[PDB]
Amino acid sequence: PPSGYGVLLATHDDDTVDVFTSGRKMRLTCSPNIDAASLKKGQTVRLNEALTVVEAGTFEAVGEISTLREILADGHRALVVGHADEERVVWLADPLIPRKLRPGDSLLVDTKAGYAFERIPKAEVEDLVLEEVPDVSYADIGGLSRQIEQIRDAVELPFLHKELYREYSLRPPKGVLLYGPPGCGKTLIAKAVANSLAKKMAEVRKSYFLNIKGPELLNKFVGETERHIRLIFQRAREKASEGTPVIVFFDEMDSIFRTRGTGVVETTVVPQLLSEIDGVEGLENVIVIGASNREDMIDPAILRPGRLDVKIKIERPDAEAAQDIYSKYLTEFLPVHADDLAEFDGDRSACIKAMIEKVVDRMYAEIDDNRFLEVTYANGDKEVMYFKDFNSGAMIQNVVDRAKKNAIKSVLETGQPGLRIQHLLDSIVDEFAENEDLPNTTNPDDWARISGKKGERIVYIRTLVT
């Protein structure tokens, strides 16, 4: 009753068959009941104490998973590469010799047995780096219309009108870069693009919008760092071959693909990235978009016409852009105290518009308390900076949040429901005084603009405070 097992290898004219068992390759004679003709290579067989083939099993579903490299000329052997580049030639099983075998497939293999038995598909790599962002649309973005129009031209139009582009022989833009001071809405534009792509794909009816951070694609091992990017680009090419647009978003491109000279592996990622981008230029549906705060720290090689042909700069909002952002945030659906409705006869829209105008005028006025920095020049006189010169959409959002928090405090304490204008009025000064000590609002781009305006290098900066 206790019986062993082995792996069949081949059949011979003398009705004897090769079997691999316990690391030993032997020749055995099958039992009269079992016919050697029906037996096939790679099939597990049952042995006994006398080493007699008494029954034939099936193909085992356990062992190592290896990558197929090529098929040998004889058609029965295949050259594959293991996990640690252990290249080996293995006989193919009977089911392997629709789906036809192709290079790069994952195959079950036993190195000890030396045979490959079955093919197992794995195409879940894109799901690891898939990122979904709902509840963002171009309607939410305020104060940015020129940049939104440009990004729509760089993404939506080539896919919408391919015939027009082919008529005028105009190559669709392949690379779009977004740069500017922090908090101006680069990630907001990126997520709006992602949501629009998801809506378009649902209309066609998602996974096509791949998003990756820089430090995500770094591995501690000596290898496998190139493999990740290779798999990403292969998956992008497969999605392009599906016909739907695919967008890969390298978020915060300052971390990786920076300048080569600066240093103290980052040396190899940028060249192979350039090679992959050049090799994927044939696919119109593959678009690479990256956002970066430090545009100077990036290698100038990639910032050339060709790969990254399109550049977009998002500047700090002015008065009208601030008004647009406030309109985007201060909606009529928030509770409003009856004091403000009394002056406007319950007209929420007009009252809110007047409140927005008032707060924008307050936060953009050259008042004494709005002085922020004292720029020092070597020869010219000193210059006074204002809070308006460092305005951003994030600051407006935080001001609105603080005003709402004050309104909640008021309705908790005095029980008067609604939002007062004084909430915004004093939240403005609170926010301005909170960021007075910190010179964090300054950015190298801001200093470059200031130095290029006045005409002298910045020598000293002083934080004015009373």
């Binding site: 996990h83 640690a84 501690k220 091992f221 000596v222 290898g223 103290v264 592996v265």
Partner: peptide, 17 residues
Amino acid sequence: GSMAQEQTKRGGGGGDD
């Protein structure tokens, strides 16, 4: 151009047996 020291970061290696 002040001379500066360095601190390296090791990369893992794959070794069997």
